[PDB]
Amino acid sequence: SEPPLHDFYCSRLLDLVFLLDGSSRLSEAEFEVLKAFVVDMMERLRVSQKWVRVAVVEYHDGSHAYIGLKDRKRPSELRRIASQVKYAGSQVASTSEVLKYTLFQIFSKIDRPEASRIALLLMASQEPQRMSRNFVRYVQGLKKKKVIVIPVGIGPHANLKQIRLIEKQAPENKAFVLSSVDELEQQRDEIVSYLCDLAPEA
């Protein structure tokens, strides 16, 4: 076990998934800022199987899960793993494929009905139209499992059309549209407060 590093600490029943855009729309430096944001967020959550569980997935044309909700590791080790996520700089970053992964590989088997489910979709690009056929269906599938999707649009290449579609699916699906990764730290606490408020108290 490890104590909180800050006074601001979400201590509720929540399963939170960080989905990171691995496309080259973000430079290696910007991706580091994105990871720093993820780490900063994690520090403000009571990470534990009995409180806030976390998952981290980097998506390109396919995806790489670095941390799974059930991974029983020290919060500090989980944060270290997140800080070490490798920069992909891929030509394509499919939001449809990563939402499919979230729906069928993260929240397929609900081992924790007592926790709220949230997917923080950090987007900086637009996937090829040929990969979006089931986009709306996966978002609706998530909605039906009460998996709240919070899209964070970063920069002008972010898929704003999909962000808007996501917001439309469920009231809790709130979007955060930022001009760049440098604005993430500015809105971090607001984002944490929003999602923590969504989760049940123990």
Q: Which domains does the chain have, with CATH numbers?
A: 1-202 (3.40.50.410)
Resolution in A: 1.8
Report the alpha-carbon distance of residue 39 to residue 34 in Å, rounded. Answer: 9
**DSSP H or E run through 73:** none
Contact present, 167 and 160 (Cβ < 8 Å): no
C-alpha distances (whole Å) from 42 to each of 21, 35, 37, 161, 181 are: 18, 11, 9, 28, 17
Q: How far apart are the first and last CA of the chain?
A: 18
Give backbone dihedrals phi and psi of 46, rounded to 5 degrees, phi first: -85, 90
Instruction: Provide the β-strand partners of residue 14.
Output: 52, 116
Q: Answer yes or no: are the C-beta atoms of 158 and 126 closer than 8 Å.
A: yes
Longest CA–CA separation in the chain, Å: 47
- Determine how β-strand 62-67 pairs with β-strand 52-60: antiparallel
Chain-centroid distance of CA 34 in Å reads 11
User: Which residues partner with 23 through β-bridges?
Assistant: 90
- Measured N-to-C along each axis, helices 184-198 and 28-43 cross at an angle, to the nearest 10 degrees, of 40
Q: How many CB atoms lie within 10 A of CB 20?
A: 29
Helix, strand and coil percent figures for the chain, each rounded to 5: 40, 25, 40
82: CB partners within 8 A, 6+ apart: 18, 35, 38, 39, 42, 56, 66, 67
Amino acid at 157: H
The answer to whether 44 touches 105, Cβ cutoff 8 Å, is: no
